[PDB]
Write a protein that binds this DNA or RNA. Structure first.
Ligand SMILES: [Ca+2]
Ligand SMILES: [Ca+2]
Lengths: 158, 157
DNA sequence: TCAGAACGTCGTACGACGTTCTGA
DNA sequence: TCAGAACGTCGTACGACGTTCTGA
């Protein structure tokens, strides 16, 4: 692992630059609560170097690689189980994205209990908090969307 | 020390992603041979995180930081002396860009003798091979232009 | 009902050039 | 004459979303 820690450090550098540690509110039509707080780590690269994404997945021992239809490729670790393990590996070497990683780790604490509306609501608040740290400009689903909906659904939060 | 090389491994990962190890032929009108082969490592980032570039310079202990006029900032290490040292630190850890690093290291061997047009010509040929590895689409000055010019200048390749 | 796998694309933060300033 | 320091900006390779597919 003296060896491994060099890999993780390298990877941390790569994610700090060409990566994206994020947390979204995704609409889920068949969820009782209508929404999920998705958490993810993602690495982007031109498909012409698709292989490096496969090397990251080997390093982490989880996650998926895909080519998108525009010449780009992506590596993605989605969801509490895989992500938490991944982020603890990178956390000591992350510099730019340590805020998002720590925040996402708080979200992951909550995900087992997001069938409870107040918990789902907590997580979504945290999710918006991550979105302020990123360079996103297309984010439309906010915590206030969740709060309006939860209320309309008959639940009680604040 | 292992703490240093965790820094360099991180830096390598950062350069691999948001960096640029490069070689260009720059026009220099007061040069006898009219051209320089410039070598450089550069790290880009939005000025809103200007500070990270200052950390990289602290880690490398050389190079310069600048704010560009479009919200971007850059950390640059230019030229053989400081560059060779930098690239040797990162080389064990670079993955995407190890080819440019090695190629540029070949160029750096030649730079102390680029008053010799035959040597300038070799360097310029190498600088072209680095450019084929980058995603550049704006490259104008090729080795062919150095050769055309040297010959016009009365030199022999 | 869940929720990852797999996906499609908008907007710019990068990359990667070429050029002028400065001074050895 | 050199050659880094400092520069200005074009074109896209990224980021960072939101949506459909699949199956537990
Ligand atoms: Ca970046
Ligand atoms: Ca990149």
């Amino acid at each position: 692992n003296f060896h491994d820690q060099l890999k993780f450090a390298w990877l941390a550098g790569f994610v700090d630059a060409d990566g994206c540690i994020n947390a979204q509110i995704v609409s889920r039509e068949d969820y009782l609560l209508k929404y999920q707080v998705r958490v993810s780590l993602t690495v982007f690269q031109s498909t012409t170097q698709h292989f490096i994404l496969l090397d990251i997945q080997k390093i982490l021992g989880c996650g998926t690689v895909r080519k998108r239809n525009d010449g780009m490729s992506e590596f993605c670790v989605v969801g509490g189980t895989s992500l938490q393990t991944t982020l603890e590996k990178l956390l000591p070497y992350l510099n730019l994205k340590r805020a998002q990683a720590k925040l996402v780790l708080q979200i992951i604490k909550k995900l087992p209990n997001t069938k409870d509306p107040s918990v789902l609501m907590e997580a979504a608040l945290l999710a918006d908090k991550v979105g302020l740290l990123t360079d996103g400009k297309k984010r439309t689903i906010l915590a206030e969307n969740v709060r309006e909906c939860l209320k309309k659904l008959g639940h009680v939060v604040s």
